[PDB]
Amino acid sequence: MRAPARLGIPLADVDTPALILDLDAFERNLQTMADWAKSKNVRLRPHAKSHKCPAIAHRQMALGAVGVCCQKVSEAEVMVDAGITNVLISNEVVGRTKLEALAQLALRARMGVCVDDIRQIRDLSEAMHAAGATIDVLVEINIGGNRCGVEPGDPAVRLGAAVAQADGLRFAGLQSYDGITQHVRDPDERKARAARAGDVTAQTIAALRDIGLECETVGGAGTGSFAFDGMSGVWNELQPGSYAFMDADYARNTPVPKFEHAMFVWAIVMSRTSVGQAVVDAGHKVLPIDSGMPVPFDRPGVRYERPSDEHGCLVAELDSALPDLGEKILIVPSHVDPTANQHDFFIGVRGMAGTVQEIWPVTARGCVF
Amino acid sequence: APARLGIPLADVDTPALILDLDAFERNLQTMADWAKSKNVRLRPHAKSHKCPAIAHRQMALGAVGVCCQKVSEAEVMVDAGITNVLISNEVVGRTKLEALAQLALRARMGVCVDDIRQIRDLSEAMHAAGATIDVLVEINIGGNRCGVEPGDPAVRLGAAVAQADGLRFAGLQSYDGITQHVRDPDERKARAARAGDVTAQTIAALRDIGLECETVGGAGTGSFAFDGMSGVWNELQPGSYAFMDADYARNTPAGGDVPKFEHAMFVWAIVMSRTSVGQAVVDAGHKVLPIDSGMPVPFDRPGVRYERPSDEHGCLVAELDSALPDLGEKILIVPSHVDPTANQHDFFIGVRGMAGTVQEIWPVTARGCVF
């Protein structure tokens, strides 16, 4: 898979569409976050689902992250293979081969996984037993996401018991994350919903303490809740992922530290037929639209709309705001995570307040198993 | 790759991209037979699968070539030996045109233009490499994306192509993506007839300056029967027809003169959380089932919907718990949209006897080809 850049060339010669990382903004975002974590004596475990890029995992580990999160065994394999020593699979795993593969991972790095069912505890036990390996296990409670996780309270307690009492499974604490909280616009709404999850998570921590189980890790938090979760004295290992790059969806939140746009799709105008519209070579195959529309970076009046597989329409009231034929433009993605998954490389660029100084493979793209 | 030849579907890893080889072959045969029956050429779109193996079966049933949206897609199809390839799109950027020039030397290539500048730069690149390319002039018929206005502006670009070196004027690209998912079939055919008329006027006004259209390219899975029988289009470009998705399943079907296609493409997913009653969570989220076109639909399993996807999770919901599959059971999901779905997987898992065991594993070799 050939990259659309070489070290040293300016931005203007990077082929399109590419995934651009403003290395200056990116490193300030990483620094901003790592400092704030330490300043509240909570651990940092950045989500690698955001970027699927070992280079960036390494950059996060250099600023004192305890490890990274992954969603799937194959992501964790890739991160381990690149010398990431501490990986939490912030998710449940079900399937004979996935668990067998997960054991083999436990032998070669400090692995974590989550469980929300006794059935998973059982199957995770035997697999680590057969391979003679041990894995830290979180119990995942459903605090409002209504995705995975057992009801908070007694149901989490019993699973916590089953994890301590089962072979190869060291009970390591709770996973407690609500995707819905992360993008609540008003920050009193966002704090209040975070505070309520905190109370529910505190009750489960307390009910486990009553049967002689401490929580080494109270895991969770996203880019929208980490500040309240970090401050609650309930969570101690924050898992934000979007914070390093930012997207248009997070831009809509009202704000605790602030993050800079550091991830962009770089697109050429390839049709300019009428006034009031320019079409770029970046459509929803490189700018997924699960979270509304991407936004042209620092170019007011100009919106991106009506994308196809391989086209985006730039539209504005003022003809010269839109780029002409042959001109390239930076586009803010609508959602960091699915956008990283649509590119084989991050093109790291310095000077953008620009020249290519890094080419990092998105090695984890395709690790869905 | 999540499978091996000989294993049953049950043992395939999740989430996987399953091709029902039986329904797929029926879809290819139906479309191939129909284009022959209406005396039009078929140039199936490869943007839909990015899978050279599928392109070969299309060529094998008498396709004149394939369509690609990007030069790097075209490059992949040529290296696998599909040697007649139209870029149903404009191309801008010296680097892309130089690579296109090098493709032209080794295959019957085509590209579209809507601007004198693309004509300028494409001639120069084709000249420099000593190659030739067939060029379609693209007209906006309702898409409101690329292409110039019908009639005179097309005529002008036609004239420029003839004049320019390495550029053979090959005719018109006339396609509207909105037309394909107009739900009412009478509404759909009327939209395609209005596009027929304005495309016919552009053909006649090009005839008045000594320019014939060898190709009148266009049509999708929604419009190909109307466009094909119009006597205006002669090279249909459907792509989704071989696979099918939930978006096309929502189209109210037209009469017996328009052929039907079966679901042949699915996402194979395991329930990896079954915590509550009336919900099961699978390991196929929107990173393997894109939702640009709306919600994927669990295959032939009524009362069960797929909703509220994250990255790596989908929620199956039912009002009757027993209808849902249980923890560790695997399920087939029809994608909402063929094209971006294919782009989220590295392999098609061909599976025979689903009406099943694995017989083919076809790499999605054009994934990544965006340049």
TrEMBL record, chain A:
Entry EC number(s): 4.1.2.42
Segments forming domain D-serine dehydratase-like: 262-350
Protein's UniProt keywords contain Lyase: yes
Domain of life, source organism: Bacteria
Gene Ontology molecular function: D-serine ammonia-lyase activity; D-threonine aldolase activity
One Pfam short name: D-ser_dehydrat
InterPro entries hit by this protein: Ala_racemase_N (IPR001608), D-amino_acid_metab_enzyme (IPR051466), D-ser_dehydrat-like_dom (IPR026956), D-ser_dehydrat-like_sf (IPR042208), PLP-binding_barrel (IPR029066)
CDD domains in the record: PLPDE_III_LS_D-TA
Top-level EC class as recorded in UniProt: lyase
Any GO BP annotation: D-serine catabolic process
Keyword Lyase: yes
Record keywords: Lyase
Entry similarity comment: Belongs to the DSD1 family.
Protein name, entry field: D-threonine aldolase
Species: Candidatus Filomicrobium marinum
From TrEMBL, chain B:
Top EC class for this record: lyase
CDD domains: PLPDE_III_LS_D-TA
Keyword Lyase in annotation: yes
InterPro entries, per database record: Ala_racemase_N, D-amino_acid_metab_enzyme, D-ser_dehydrat-like_dom, D-ser_dehydrat-like_sf, PLP-binding_barrel
GO biological process: D-serine catabolic process
Origin superkingdom: Bacteria
GO molecular function annotation: D-serine ammonia-lyase activity; D-threonine aldolase activity
Record's keyword terms, sorted: Lyase
Residue stretches making up the D-serine dehydratase-like domain: 264-352
EC numbers on record: 4.1.2.42
Similarity comment: family membership: Belongs to the DSD1 family.
PANTHER family according to UniProt: D-SERINE DEHYDRATASE (PTHR28004:SF2), ZGC:162816-RELATED (PTHR28004)
Identification of the protein by name: D-threonine aldolase
